[PDB]
Design an enzyme around this catalytic site. Structure first.
Site, PDB file in Angstrom:
ATOM      1  N   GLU A   1      -4.854   4.544 -10.517  1.00 15.81           N
ATOM      2  CA  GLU A   1      -5.969   3.273 -10.348  1.00 15.81           C
ATOM      3  C   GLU A   1      -7.147   3.308 -11.257  1.00 15.81           C
ATOM      4  O   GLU A   1      -7.433   2.284 -11.728  1.00 15.81           O
ATOM      5  CB  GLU A   1      -6.362   3.307  -8.748  1.00 15.81           C
ATOM      6  CG  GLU A   1      -5.278   3.135  -7.824  1.00 15.81           C
ATOM      7  CD  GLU A   1      -5.750   3.120  -6.531  1.00 15.81           C
ATOM      8  OE1 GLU A   1      -6.155   1.965  -6.340  1.00 15.81           O
ATOM      9  OE2 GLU A   1      -6.002   4.032  -5.738  1.00 15.81           O
TER      10      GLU A   1
ATOM     11  N   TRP B   1      -9.158   6.690  -0.421  1.00 16.88           N
ATOM     12  CA  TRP B   1      -9.527   7.323  -1.546  1.00 16.88           C
ATOM     13  C   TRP B   1      -8.460   7.122  -2.566  1.00 16.88           C
ATOM     14  O   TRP B   1      -7.578   6.630  -2.525  1.00 16.88           O
ATOM     15  CB  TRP B   1      -9.359   8.845  -1.497  1.00 16.88           C
ATOM     16  CG  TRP B   1      -8.297   9.246  -0.693  1.00 16.88           C
ATOM     17  CD1 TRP B   1      -6.888   9.584  -1.169  1.00 16.88           C
ATOM     18  CD2 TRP B   1      -7.863   9.798   0.744  1.00 16.88           C
ATOM     19  NE1 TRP B   1      -5.840   9.946  -0.321  1.00 16.88           N
ATOM     20  CE2 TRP B   1      -6.537  10.015   0.777  1.00 16.88           C
ATOM     21  CE3 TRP B   1      -8.748   9.724   1.778  1.00 16.88           C
ATOM     22  CZ2 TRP B   1      -6.017  10.423   2.036  1.00 16.88           C
ATOM     23  CZ3 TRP B   1      -8.034   9.829   2.940  1.00 16.88           C
ATOM     24  CH2 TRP B   1      -6.715  10.191   3.334  1.00 16.88           C
TER      25      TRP B   1
ATOM     26  N   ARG C   1       0.013   4.457   2.876  1.00 15.86           N
ATOM     27  CA  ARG C   1       0.079   4.122   4.180  1.00 15.86           C
ATOM     28  C   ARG C   1       0.593   5.338   5.219  1.00 15.86           C
ATOM     29  O   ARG C   1       0.541   5.224   6.560  1.00 15.86           O
ATOM     30  CB  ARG C   1       1.291   2.889   4.730  1.00 15.86           C
ATOM     31  CG  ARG C   1       0.575   1.685   4.316  1.00 15.86           C
ATOM     32  CD  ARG C   1       1.733   0.354   4.602  1.00 15.86           C
ATOM     33  NE  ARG C   1       2.742   0.420   3.509  1.00 15.86           N
ATOM     34  CZ  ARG C   1       3.900  -0.245   3.672  1.00 15.86           C
ATOM     35  NH1 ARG C   1       4.214  -0.435   4.710  1.00 15.86           N
ATOM     36  NH2 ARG C   1       4.540  -0.218   2.769  1.00 15.86           N
TER      37      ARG C   1
ATOM     38  N   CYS D   1       0.817  -1.118  -0.099  1.00 13.11           N
ATOM     39  CA  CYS D   1       0.132   0.198  -0.081  1.00 13.11           C
ATOM     40  C   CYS D   1       0.668   1.336  -0.015  1.00 13.11           C
ATOM     41  O   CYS D   1       1.536   1.508   1.005  1.00 13.11           O
ATOM     42  CB  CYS D   1      -0.973   0.056   1.147  1.00 13.11           C
ATOM     43  SG  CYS D   1      -2.008   1.621   1.324  1.00 13.11           S
TER      44      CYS D   1
HETATM   45  C1  HEM Z   1      -6.228   6.484   2.055  1.00 13.46           C
HETATM   46  C2  HEM Z   1      -5.706   6.443   0.999  1.00 13.46           C
HETATM   47  C3  HEM Z   1      -5.210   5.195   0.267  1.00 13.46           C
HETATM   48  C4  HEM Z   1      -4.412   5.091  -1.012  1.00 13.46           C
HETATM   49  C5  HEM Z   1      -4.159   6.501  -1.867  1.00 13.46           C
HETATM   50  C6  HEM Z   1      -4.133   3.777  -1.165  1.00 13.46           C
HETATM   51  C7  HEM Z   1      -3.538   3.315  -2.192  1.00 13.46           C
HETATM   52  C8  HEM Z   1      -3.098   2.040  -2.672  1.00 13.46           C
HETATM   53  C9  HEM Z   1      -3.137   1.528  -3.690  1.00 13.46           C
HETATM   54  C10 HEM Z   1      -2.674   2.272  -5.391  1.00 13.46           C
HETATM   55  C11 HEM Z   1      -2.716  -0.005  -3.520  1.00 13.46           C
HETATM   56  C12 HEM Z   1      -2.508  -0.782  -4.952  1.00 13.46           C
HETATM   57  C13 HEM Z   1      -3.495  -1.020  -5.434  1.00 13.46           C
HETATM   58  C14 HEM Z   1      -3.585  -1.542  -6.866  1.00 13.46           C
HETATM   59  O1  HEM Z   1      -3.047  -2.635  -6.920  1.00 13.46           O
HETATM   60  O2  HEM Z   1      -4.091  -1.173  -7.743  1.00 13.46           O
HETATM   61  C15 HEM Z   1      -2.886  -0.098  -2.236  1.00 13.46           C
HETATM   62  C16 HEM Z   1      -2.850  -1.602  -1.807  1.00 13.46           C
HETATM   63  C17 HEM Z   1      -3.431  -1.886  -0.687  1.00 13.46           C
HETATM   64  N1  HEM Z   1      -4.029  -0.838   0.462  1.00 13.46           N
HETATM   65 FE1  HEM Z   1      -4.057   1.229   0.340  1.00 13.46          FE
HETATM   66  N2  HEM Z   1      -4.389   2.909  -0.147  1.00 13.46           N
HETATM   67  C18 HEM Z   1      -5.255   3.656   0.683  1.00 13.46           C
HETATM   68  C19 HEM Z   1      -5.883   3.291   1.774  1.00 13.46           C
HETATM   69  C20 HEM Z   1      -5.746   2.129   2.487  1.00 13.46           C
HETATM   70  C21 HEM Z   1      -6.298   1.731   3.559  1.00 13.46           C
HETATM   71  C22 HEM Z   1      -7.179   2.622   4.604  1.00 13.46           C
HETATM   72  C23 HEM Z   1      -6.186   0.309   3.835  1.00 13.46           C
HETATM   73  C24 HEM Z   1      -6.646  -0.421   5.144  1.00 13.46           C
HETATM   74  C25 HEM Z   1      -7.165  -0.155   6.233  1.00 13.46           C
HETATM   75  C26 HEM Z   1      -5.339  -0.050   2.727  1.00 13.46           C
HETATM   76  C27 HEM Z   1      -4.684  -1.314   2.611  1.00 13.46           C
HETATM   77  C28 HEM Z   1      -4.191  -1.886   1.463  1.00 13.46           C
HETATM   78  C29 HEM Z   1      -3.978  -2.924   1.311  1.00 13.46           C
HETATM   79  C30 HEM Z   1      -4.055  -4.341   2.173  1.00 13.46           C
HETATM   80  C31 HEM Z   1      -3.386  -3.044  -0.131  1.00 13.46           C
HETATM   81  C32 HEM Z   1      -2.746  -4.317  -0.938  1.00 13.46           C
HETATM   82  C33 HEM Z   1      -3.994  -4.709  -1.672  1.00 13.46           C
HETATM   83  C34 HEM Z   1      -3.739  -5.965  -2.640  1.00 13.46           C
HETATM   84  O3  HEM Z   1      -2.911  -6.655  -2.360  1.00 13.46           O
HETATM   85  O4  HEM Z   1      -4.639  -6.366  -3.720  1.00 13.46           O
HETATM   86  N3  HEM Z   1      -4.952   1.131   1.926  1.00 13.46           N
HETATM   87  N4  HEM Z   1      -3.295   1.053  -1.591  1.00 13.46           N
HETATM   88  C1  WOS Z   2      -8.499   1.092   0.499  1.00 10.61           C
HETATM   89  C2  WOS Z   2      -7.878   1.254  -1.080  1.00 10.61           C
HETATM   90  C3  WOS Z   2      -7.506   2.344  -1.515  1.00 10.61           C
HETATM   91  C4  WOS Z   2      -6.879   2.717  -2.838  1.00 10.61           C
HETATM   92  N1  WOS Z   2      -6.668   4.020  -3.123  1.00 10.61           N
HETATM   93  N2  WOS Z   2      -6.872   1.616  -3.628  1.00 10.61           N
HETATM   94  C5  WOS Z   2      -7.141   0.317  -3.186  1.00 10.61           C
HETATM   95  C6  WOS Z   2      -7.012  -0.824  -4.132  1.00 10.61           C
HETATM   96  C7  WOS Z   2      -6.814  -2.068  -3.486  1.00 10.61           C
HETATM   97  C8  WOS Z   2      -6.723  -3.326  -4.703  1.00 10.61           C
HETATM   98  C9  WOS Z   2      -6.131  -3.344  -5.629  1.00 10.61           C
HETATM   99  N3  WOS Z   2      -6.168  -4.514  -6.558  1.00 10.61           N
HETATM  100  C10 WOS Z   2      -6.817  -5.312  -6.271  1.00 10.61           C
HETATM  101  C11 WOS Z   2      -7.571  -5.421  -5.199  1.00 10.61           C
HETATM  102  N4  WOS Z   2      -8.238  -6.596  -4.653  1.00 10.61           N
HETATM  103  C12 WOS Z   2      -8.601  -6.897  -3.404  1.00 10.61           C
HETATM  104  C13 WOS Z   2      -7.720  -8.079  -2.983  1.00 10.61           C
HETATM  105  O1  WOS Z   2      -8.266  -9.120  -3.687  1.00 10.61           O
HETATM  106  C14 WOS Z   2      -8.130  -8.921  -5.102  1.00 10.61           C
HETATM  107  C15 WOS Z   2      -8.859  -7.575  -5.756  1.00 10.61           C
HETATM  108  C16 WOS Z   2      -7.453  -4.604  -4.158  1.00 10.61           C
HETATM  109  C17 WOS Z   2      -7.636   0.207  -2.079  1.00 10.61           C
END
Ligand code: HEM
Ligand code: WOS
Ligand code: HEM
Ligand code: WOS
Ligand code: H4B
Ligand code: H4B
Ligand code: ZN
Lengths: 407, 411
Positions: free
Chosen positions: B285, B280, B111, B108
């Protein structure tokens, strides 16, 4: 133990089994992944030689033959006697081609089998080295129709007689610090450019001065040589739409030629082995031009485009990045110098990968280096799962000579 | 053992000691890196060590390690385990846990916001209708009229794994995708399978290009139920471009609230299988993955055509040229409508500062480079030049299989 790699764009899955022949370590452990870290005797030598000769005779469908047995025997003889051995030319060629084939960070490996290998093992002096490098450059440039090549200097002996090319590439521009605190030319070479001057180079203190060669033969002190300009094919950079682009005064050279790596074949170490192919567009336009630690001209191109550089969210950096890469690709094609765009290269690597999984059982690949520095996810390598591991023969990194060299 | 990571743009070197507190595997070995691979019933036996390890972390963070309060809690949890085979988290522990799961989310880039997370305790929930209500309140709160707020809703933990709570949607808000007779796709190609499931479950599909999917909610291991999110709660932004007037005519829009709903939250050995969380969007994305992936809305073609780019050879970089305009449009649209969003330059810059801060105060920041680096313009963001260490801390968010592949249907 048998591993799966999925492409997430095409759902295709390959099964890697080649990794079980992996010899060297990766930096990674079960507890920590280091895939984004840039760089993490007679007894020793015999097994190394056997592993190699084994795979060699295997490739020529002559495994277990007497020719195989005899060579294993003879090389064994030579090691027990001389504490080293020499490669037959055929082995050397196979070894060089395979070190490229095993280069996990190289996106261009679909070309691996068409490598021209120049054997420079008879070389003895820096002047001799200079001659070989000039010929390499000329063969490879080929008036713009670039051809892959490697030139291999004598192998390491007691470590006190190493051959080294001190330049990182055969052809790079100098870097000079200015009294006004900034940097003129290429900041990546400021230290090497110092050492050149420190060794007698007469720098024209320009912005695109082709660096001199610094050649070390037989563990001796390194000597300076200027590449004949007539052999350094350069491309002036213009944009096919913006006239003002030419006014920036950008040019870049056509031949990418890595010279600081170590070729390891069958336990033998070739510390001087400059090799070259041709550029992927993004290497120049994205990395060389737009990196902060380099020519860093984004701001200037952006200003000439009059984009709003008030807020990052106008993506002016991105917009400028595109034109610059459009122009680089444009100049090279115009001047008929070989170059490939990141779309075509990554697509080629996907075909190659599938080929390698099919005819070899895998293909070591490093995703962090395969995915281009721009437009990453619109290329098919982005969605391609890759496995990284180290097979031999191989190109390895080695310390900069100036830290090591006893003067 | 110390570990050094370098930034190759700044030569700032950092030292990691935090990786020492890592227990879970990575997928990697001494002989293979699997760092680009997308995917790498619990007894009293293993449960208490997990409980203890968590409670030790928790009490350190509040500066009460070894306190009587600490010791009594351990003995409390121990007894609850050996007598009931599980235990319940205090609210303070649950909040601490969810915040840290996010903080440990090595993939993420967002964070930096981790300390500001509204945690909604939905552990008293018993039915799907109860789930719908919690989720609706989450969406309303999180959306906040476009001024988005990070939130997570936590449903009851797994017990015997035969009574799981699950949200079948991958995200709370997503568009349907329908496969046509002729092989093409209407809507979002990523959601074809889920749409089918829903349709089978009795959803009347409007069959347009931007249909918000219903919620499919499983409570207590029972069969899942359909609910439509109230449209007034679903914030959407019409996509237009600041220079190109024809862009609005493409008829694109996107929802403002990214909210992941298919992940598993692990805290102190406890498994929370339904824990939707939301933040957000980072511009890319939507503009890079959602619109321009080959396996998604795939509008690169049309956008390039309307810009009249030279599409005969890829060497014109028409694909890259269009990609940028779409992302400019996504950002322009969200900002104009005052819906919170971050561009990839601001996001990665902030992550870099966060990371350095995490190294100083915490001793490390696990990070998956392959995922942190944005999917366009990679090397003109500061994270591209940043060496990162990846490893797994708990609490954490884990993947878990899709529920239609494991669920035991009741009828
Ligand atoms: C608040 C603004 C946030 C932004 C801008 C953000 C951005 C992102 C992005 C760009 C990714 C990768 C997404 C993708 O693969 O397309 C990601 C992954 C992730 N985020 Fe964040 N995020 C945010 C908040 C959060 C919050 C609140 C949580 C949990 C409480 C979180 C937990 C995670 C987790 C667990 C992943 C890995 C997702 C996966 O493996 O598919 N994020 N985040
Ligand atoms: C909380 C949050 C914020 C943000 N800006 N972007 C994401 C994207 C997370 C995200 C990105 N790509 C695949 C998944 N999946 C959830 C896990 O299982 C596969 C689909 C989730 C999540
Ligand atoms: C012919 C066209 C070629 C192309 C398009 C190409 C492309 C690339 C690219 C893009 C990289 C990434 C490095 C970076 O971006 O900094 C790379 C690395 C590398 N290439 Fe290839 N290359 C070519 C030829 C060759 C040849 C002929 C060899 C050897 C015989 C070779 C061996 C390597 C090695 C060993 C690396 C890793 C170097 C490092 O670790 O820094 N390449 N190549
Ligand atoms: C042969 C070749 C073709 C091509 N298109 N690109 C390169 C890459 C040049 C290159 C890329 N990455 C690191 C280095 N260094 C020299 C080796 O040591 C690290 C720096 C050099 C090489
Ligand atoms: C194979 C590879 O791991 C896969 O394409 C990953 C690469 N990096 C990614 N990065 C982000 N942010 N999101 C993704 O879905 C992916 N996919
Ligand atoms: C820190 C990071 O590993 C470093 O910037 C790497 C990332 N990927 C790269 N990829 C290529 N092709 N060339 C590089 O020099 C790098 N540098
Ligand atoms: Zn790894």
């Amino acid at each position: 133990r048998f591993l799966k790699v999925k492409n997430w764009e095409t759902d295709v899955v390959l099964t890697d089994t080649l990794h079980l022949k992996s010899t060297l370590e990766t930096g990674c452990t079960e507890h920590i992944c280091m895939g984004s870290i840039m760089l993490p005797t007679k007894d020793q030598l015999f097994p190394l030689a056997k592993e190699f000769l084994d795979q060699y005779y295997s490739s020529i469908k002559r495994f277990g033959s007497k020719a195989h047995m005899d060579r294993l025997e003879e090389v064994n003889k030579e090691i027990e006697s001389t504490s080293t051995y020499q490669l037959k030319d055929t082995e050397l060629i196979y070894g060089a081609k395979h070190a490229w084939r095993n280069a996990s960070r190289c996106v261009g490996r679909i070309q691996w089998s068409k490598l021209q290998v120049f054997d420079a093992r008879d070389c003895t002096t820096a002047h001799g080295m200079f001659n070989y490098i000039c010929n390499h450059v000329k063969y490879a440039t080929n008036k713009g129709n670039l051809r892959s090549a490697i030139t291999i200097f004598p192998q390491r002996t007691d470590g006190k007689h190493d051959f080294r090319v001190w330049n990182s590439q055969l052809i790079r521009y100098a870097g000079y610090k200015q009294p006004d605190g900034s940097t003129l030319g290429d900041p990546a070479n400021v230290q090497f450019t110092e050492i050149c001057i420190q060794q007698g180079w007469k720098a024209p203190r320009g912005r695109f001065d082709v660096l001199p060669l610094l050649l070390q033969a037989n563990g001796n002190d390194p000597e300076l040589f200027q590449i004949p300009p007539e052999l350094v094919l350069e491309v002036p950079i213009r944009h096919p739409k913006f006239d003002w682009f030419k006014d920036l005064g950008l040019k870049w050279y056509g031949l990418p030629a890595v010279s600081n790596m170590l070729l390891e074949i069958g336990g033998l170490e070739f510390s001087a082995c400059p090799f070259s192919g041709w550029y992927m567009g993004t290497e120049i336009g994205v990395r060389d031009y737009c990196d902060n630690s380099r020519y860093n001209i984004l701001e200037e191109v952006a200003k000439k485009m009059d984009l709003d550089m008030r807020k990052t969210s106008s993506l002016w950096k991105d917009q400028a990045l595109v034109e610059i890469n459009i122009a680089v690709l444009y100049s090279f094609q115009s001047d008929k110098v070989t170059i490939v765009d990141h779309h075509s290269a990554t697509e080629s690597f996907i075909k190659h990968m599938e080929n390698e999984y099919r005819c070899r059982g895998g293909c070591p690949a490093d995703w962090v280096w395969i995915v281009p520095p721009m437009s990453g996810s619109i290329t098919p390598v982005f969605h391609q799962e890759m496995l990284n591991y180290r097979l031999t023969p191989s190109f390895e990194y080695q310390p900069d000579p100036w830290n090591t060299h006893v003067w």
